[PDB]
Amino acid sequence: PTFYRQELNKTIWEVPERYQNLSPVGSSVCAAFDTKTGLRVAVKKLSRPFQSIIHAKRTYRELRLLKHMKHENVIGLLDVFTPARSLEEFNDVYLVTHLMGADLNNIVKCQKLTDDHVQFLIYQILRGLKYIHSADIIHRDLKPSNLAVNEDCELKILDFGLTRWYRAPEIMLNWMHYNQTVDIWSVGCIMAELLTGRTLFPGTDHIDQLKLILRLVGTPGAELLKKISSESARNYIQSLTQMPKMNFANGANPLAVDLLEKMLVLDSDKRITAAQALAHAYFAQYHDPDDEPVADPYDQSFESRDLLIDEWKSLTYDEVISFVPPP
Ligand SMILES: O=C(NCCN1CCOCC1)c1ccc2c(c1)C(=O)c1ccc(Nc3ccc(F)c(NC(=O)c4ccccc4)c3)cc1CC2
Ligand SMILES: CCCCCCCCO[C@@H]1O[C@H](CO)[C@@H](O)[C@H](O)[C@H]1O
Ligand SMILES: CCCCCCCCO[C@@H]1O[C@H](CO)[C@@H](O)[C@H](O)[C@H]1O
């Protein structure tokens, strides 16, 4: 197609004519109208995609991830393009996705949602996670600003498989062997916040974050302590004034409360999974076991490769070129 060129976010964006009305939304992404499909779309121009091995692999990962994900509650690739006509001139990558029009913070505006609205919202998050997790992909930094939401409150998860208020405690402690339920922790934090209008653990800093979590969920149990090898870390922990798991309750729906108690567990092996959460009574209104799909297997064999820049770049080119838009 025919491209045109335009100054946006401090650079020259060169895009096909189909895409019009480009205007910045954030850290880079523009909102636009795809005149060809009649959809509002987000167009993301990658910064310095092939600068280094690390940038190149990250560019490739993003494209691979977005190509793979085909689910209503997960952002997916509507188009990818480049101004370049060949490999050698290939230096820019643009990704095009649905434009939802707001993130979850924009929907909450520090206000309590009704229990029914929380249901619908959390349901969709979990439905997206089941899918993501079924491909052995973990978000790791799930939060309201990564959840894109339209007027109808249909929700899509952004930026999976790559501010500490939604983070699993083990990630903050650089545990290194993360299980999928790190995202579940995040889910409970978001859920509590939808229901109260207030951040569940608004830590002032790293150590304060861990403190607020400890105070609510209580000090680590015996089984959990068994799984920590450092004597000094156990020493610290068990020398603290010992601390009960406070009552989560304290007019919320008791089913919400129960679900939250099963998400917000220090021990990640004991947290409820996305699929178990979707079957929890809290979601009786929305749960449909025959429309909570899994993903096709995802070829992640690239993650373990150490390749040269030119190969990362060529692999990316090849994916731009093979790209087939959805229905
Ligand atoms: O339309 C918005 N307008 C803001 C200005 N106002 C105008 C009108 O009034 C209200 C809004 C708006 C405001 C906020 C948001 C979106 C849109 C949104 O749809 C939206 C859509 C996409 C997006 N990010 C995005 C875009 C393209 C991508 F390729 C990615 N990449 C990833 O998600 C990703 C996935 C896997 C690995 C790595 C990255 C992410 C980020 C947002 C941010 C939330
Ligand atoms: C504030 C201090 C509490 C930190 C306790 C974190 C417990 C995390 O849970 C742990 O997750 C690891 C996966 O990352 C698993 O390997 C361990 O089996 C599991 O116990
Ligand atoms: C207030 C925060 C103090 C909590 C101390 C947690 C330190 C956990 O340390 C973790 O233990 C795991 C199992 O032994 C190891 O696999 C990880 O390498 C290590 O990070």
Curated annotation (Swiss-Prot):
Q: Give a brief account of the tissues where this protein occurs.
A: Brain, heart, placenta, pancreas and skeletal muscle. Expressed to a lesser extent in lung, liver and kidney.
Q: Mutating residue 44 to R has which effect?
A: Loss of kinase activity
SUPFAM superfamilies linked to this entry: Protein kinase-like (PK-like)
Any idea which residues are catalytic in this one?
159
N6-acetyllysine is carried by which residues? 44, 143
| The reaction(s) this protein catalyses | L-seryl-[protein] + ATP = O-phospho-L-seryl-[protein] + ADP + H(+); L-threonyl-[protein] + ATP = O-phospho-L-threonyl-[protein] + ADP + H(+)
Keyword annotations for this protein, in alphabetical order, are: Acetylation, Apoptosis, ATP-binding, Cytoplasm, Kinase, Nucleotide-binding, Nucleus, Phosphoprotein, Serine/threonine-protein kinase, Stress response, Transcription, Transcription regulation, Transferase, Ubl conjugation
**Which cofactor(s) are needed, names only?**
Mg(2+)
User: What residues does the Protein kinase domain cover?
Assistant: 19-283
Keyword Transcription regulation attributed: yes
Control of this protein's activity is summarized as:
Activated by cell stresses such as DNA damage, heat shock, osmotic shock, anisomycin and sodium arsenite, as well as pro-inflammatory stimuli such as bacterial lipopolysaccharide (LPS) and interleukin-1.
Q: Which residues carry this modification: Phosphothreonine?
A: 11, 241
> So what EC number does this one have?
2.7.11.24
Gene Ontology biological-process entries: 3'-UTR-mediated mRNA stabilization; angiogenesis; apoptotic process; bone development; cartilage condensation; cell morphogenesis; cell surface receptor protein serine/threonine kinase signaling pathway; cell surface receptor signaling pathway
Q: Which InterPro entries match?
A: Kinase-like_dom_sf, MAP_kinase, MAP_kinase_CS, MAPK14, MAPK_p38-like, Prot_kinase_dom, Protein_kinase_ATP_BS
* Entry domain remark: The TXY motif contains the threonine and tyrosine residues whose phosphorylation activates the MAP kinases.
Q: Which family does it belong to?
A: Belongs to the protein kinase superfamily. CMGC Ser/Thr protein kinase family. MAP kinase subfamily.
Query: What function does the entry list?
Result: Serine/threonine kinase which acts as an essential component of the MAP kinase signal transduction pathway. MAPK14 is one of the four p38 MAPKs which play an important role in the cascades of cellular responses evoked by extracellular stimuli such as pro-inflammatory cytokines or physical stress leading to direct activation of transcription factors. Accordingly, p38 MAPKs phosphorylate a broad range of proteins and it has been estimated that they may have approximately 200 to 300 substrates each.
Q: What is the protein's quaternary organization?
A: Component of a signaling complex containing at least AKAP13, PKN1, MAPK14, ZAK and MAP2K3. Within this complex, AKAP13 interacts directly with PKN1, which in turn recruits MAPK14, MAP2K3 and ZAK. Binds to a kinase interaction motif within the protein tyrosine phosphatase, PTPRR. This interaction retains MAPK14 in the cytoplasm and prevents nuclear accumulation. Interacts with SPAG9 and GADD45A. Interacts with CDC25B, CDC25C, DUSP1, DUSP10, DUSP16, NP60, SUPT20H and TAB1. Interacts with casein kinase II subunits CSNK2A1 and CSNK2B. Interacts with PPM1D.
**Protein name stated in the entry:** Mitogen-activated protein kinase 14
Q: Which organism is it from?
A: Homo sapiens
Instruction: Give the organism's phylogenetic lineage.
Output: Eukaryota, Metazoa, Chordata, Craniata, Vertebrata
